[model samples]
Target: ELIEVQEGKAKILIPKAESIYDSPVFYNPRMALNRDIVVVLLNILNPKIVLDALSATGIRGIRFALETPAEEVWLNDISEDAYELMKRNVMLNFDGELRESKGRAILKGEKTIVINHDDANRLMAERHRYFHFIDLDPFGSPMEFLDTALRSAKRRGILGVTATDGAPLCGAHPRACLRKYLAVPLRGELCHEVGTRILVGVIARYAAKYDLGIDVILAYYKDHYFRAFVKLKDGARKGDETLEKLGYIYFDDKTGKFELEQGFLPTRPNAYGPVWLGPLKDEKIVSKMVKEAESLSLARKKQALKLLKMIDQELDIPLFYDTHAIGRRKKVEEIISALREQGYEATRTHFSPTGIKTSAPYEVFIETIKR
Candidate 1:
């Protein structure tokens, strides 16, 4: 059967209906879930070449050619029907006898085109062609094709990926998320953040193995979907800077508390990764988050604060003196002690009822204070 989709902007010849995956199509291009955001992120990178590795109906590729800043675009699918539909769509949208030779409607030249009647994985592995931008949108999750993507990208390439399987990465099931994305699951309103961090860690480890650095530039949690964009740095040794500034920050999500892991800010951009970009929560916020601590019920807010104080008492300053939660003084003595033990001059000022004020470097304060 020959059919026109998207109101004839694209045409398709179906060899067998069974070969197709009926994706929930939307009329508003911006409303496109994974494809929409991926295209936007890719446009931001301004890559010379773009690949929709798992292009289903070729809509994404055609969209990219029409919408993005890439000079060349390749859309690959495992189905012949998809290939036919993509070709029809491109010609219909770009080239046409009705498109007066005004050259306005013409697509400059035919954008790069290829169809993989075989397995896309096989083609990518065998061709070994590196792309400047690669968009991998699989049915469920893109974890399986990660190695291929990392290998297929040229140095400094931007990778746009979408993982539709939120259940696994969001800790709906531990083994799957951990095995696939290497995400550390923490239960709470921030499970979404955990999922994103897990992906970041996985990508970082992969790049580290290749002597490269991957920085997550953007991330968003929309409905059940998660999308992110990462820029690659080939052996730039930028990840090392994360350690210099972030060091050993303690995060006990089991309880809402954090403290400096180690070290102070040596410098800005080069020292701390772009992840830390916030002022420490002020006394008001801390009090709001930690108030009623002295009399709250067991497992309740007060008990949680008591536990924080207990943990706070164990940390001394000097070792971490330059680091203290400036606006948090609920456990100022403990925070100061931890900083001092680590070696640094420190004192607590009660300028704010619940904050810890210190003379530490910016990074030290951040590591000790940021949530």
Candidate 2:
């Protein structure tokens, strides 16, 4: 059941009958854009070591080895079939042979790649092992791997996390969101951004336990997954600084309007989390993404270009106003144009099609849209 799939700069063998959730050797063509974005980040970060936890078909790790300036890449999985397939995939891409040492396939002849059949968390938790970048693209929630990931990364390392359990994160199952992410999700038009922010908050909290802080570089929700990339800094002081950015979001259940507020609010109605009240995206990184989009594959390039442009224009402000939710669907463009003409910044958000991310006050926006 072998099939060839080309992604990024690697052509690897994929198991045609594999289920991503159950099979260790799995491949999903739908996540090409996701992997493409990872490549762009790798070009920017230029990491020395990348640990692609849950390596599956070894597509992501192999791509990093072949495409980026990474010195070493670890493709790890707990399943034997995946490890075997990964070894073959590595050989398919790199001019190297696999050596069996302690029942694991270790690459030889110039390529600093290793395929390990071990639990991802256990592999990362090993002593004296630190990665410059760790990608936690698991099937469901990535929360189970965050602590070990945060502990195993270098002081200034980058962590890329993916969560495909959108139903819980987006508030379809409130208890599940609270249990896993430890934050309340907003089940409305703003849920996408809110869900992403909640994930950042959860990761930040996990890092805080190890006296580490996280600065979100890029975070977004697309299709069925919520993805975030953050730069980690070590220190109790740094952790405290990041903690200060964690707070609450109050959205009017009736009006669909939302506000970001610092600290807890007692007796407050319609509150969501102790979530991330800070910036969801770094403007500098997003600006870089816009420039890198052109070189990506056609399917990835088009959406990446569109999303990056919109993300670049989006303000650092949290919470966006949905035009249709406010009963001004047709007038959204008109209002945004007017707002810009009046010297205010009004731009579309990648979060929602009819949503506007602006620097204007809520009252002014409501009034402008009405007019």
Candidate 3:
């Protein structure tokens, strides 16, 4: 069963299906905020041609056509059932031409909406360097599609990547993470930042193969998944420089300190494996999003704006000081106030309710927490 729902400026039908174990048309209501945030970004990026590589229900692509200035949006999926549903959903929103003979459905109006039913990899291979913006929101890990996306995404394109398999990426299943991301993660919730970085690290490495550097315009953890909006730039020098940003997330148990270390391997076996050790979001772009986030009448508008503002001011540090753990004996407010008085750059992080992204030394924080 599929029900018509309105999200953002467009209305589309979504599957009223059962479990993820065996659902035909996949769509997650929790992912609405993801789409809300992306809509705000698309308003900012204004890319002409876009591709939603895994278009389960066609909402993301539909939203792109309805909300953004994109001239063309290719809504695609691997499932034949999903392909049929995408056709219905696409026509439900806009008036367009359907070239059934060519295995394409075009929603012809303000933006050309193209529906593709094929393997994502094969489609990307066919349309190499043809997209100005490519979004990969696979049901699970997005790693399998990164290489082709990096190749097909225009040199100056934008890639919106989402990885929903948090267990592997967050170290609940370390070996699986290694198998997919080729990066290790520390076991614990603090690895949220670590996992987010690992996702970017994998993209950075894949992007470099095409001699294309990526500027992470936006990267964040939504608790259940990781999303990154990366800008691809062409040049061997740029790619070489992008590699310079890859490193590892570490924790110094001696001082209850978590830090990002610059190396493929951790200094000690206890630390996490290599991840992106650079700034997660582009400050300038995030600042623009802050304004765009406000005007969007999304169901989660407040949450979206809050997230944008938080990302705008989020510290560049790899992982935050888990104040709840670090200040177990002390209060977060007291610790933050204590650090501020001592000339430390202490700020609240978006990642945790009781986390601080600070420039204070371990001793300073420890002493402050004790006090």
Candidate 4:
């Protein structure tokens, strides 16, 4: 059975099922905050055209059409049921007729919604740098779409990608991580951040292949996924510059220390990653996002606002220390205060509640914690 639901400004029809897979078409209420964050981005980036490349239920694309001032949004899905359901949703929400031509379900208006039934990669690659914003929120790793998604992006545009395959990215399945992202995962306290970097690193690598440079405007690890919005710029020189940001890292559990060395060459025999060692979030872009989020006061306002502020305040320094992983019998504040009193940078990280992103070296952190 299909049920009507509101997310952001879009009223969507989603299937009622015990499990996500049980539905004919997919909709995950858990991703509501992510959708809200996307709207904030849409308001900020103001891309002329947007693509929901793997729009299973078309909830995000619908929201883009209703909530933002984007000129057009193409919502495509290979699943037949999803395409039909999306058409129905457009009619249900916009009170518009779905005009079918070949494989497309068109909801035409000043701000249009075009639903396509085709392979996501095929549509993107064929478009040839047509879309200003391409969002790929697949069920698993975004690896499969990165190459074409980058190919389809306008010279200057946003490529939003989400990696839901946590096991591989976070190091539970190191072989999978290597095969998919071509990076080793960090298996301990810093796995989430490292995993997210691997995701961005992989996107950067793919962008480099197409002579495109990527500036990570925003990157974060949420409850069960990692999301990144990379701004694409053309030129081999820019691509090389982006590649220079890639590197390897090591987190020494015993020392409560980690080093993010900027190079492909491993610092240790079993280094944690060849992840994106550069800044995760562009402070200026994140600040704009926060302002946009505040203006919207989204339905998930509390959650989205908190996240943006945390990201804004959180240091852009590489990696973080897990309180539980390091010293015992110490409070997080005590450690943070001690580090700050000693003139070392220390702040709470959104990655983990007990985690601290600090400029202090492992030895200094351990020393301060002992006080």
Regions of model 2 farther than 4 Å from truth: 18-24, 127-129, 264-269, 296-299, 328-331
Q: Estimate the TM-score for candidate 2.
A: 0.94
- Quote model 1's TM-score: 0.58
Rank order (by lDDT, best first): 4, 3, 2, 1
The TM-score-based order of candidates, best leading, equals 4, 3, 2, 1
Best by TM-score: 4
Tens digits of per-residue lDDT for model 1, 197-270: 45555565566566666655554344565555667677647655422322322334433343443343323222
- As for model 2, its CA RMSD to the true structure in angstroms is 2.1
- If both were scored by TM-score, which would come out higher, candidate 1 or candidate 2? 2
lDDT of 2 at 294: 70
lDDT minimum window of 10 residues, candidate 4: 264-273
In order of listing, the candidates' clash counts read 33, 0, 3, 0
- Where's the lowest-lDDT run of ten residues in candidate 3? 95-104
Query: What are the per-residue Cα lDDT tens digits for candidate 2 across 16-131?
Result: 66365544466777898888888877887788888998998888899888877788888999878888888889999988457866646777555588888899888998923389
**Which regions of candidate 4 deviate over 4 angstroms?**
none
Best by lDDT: 4
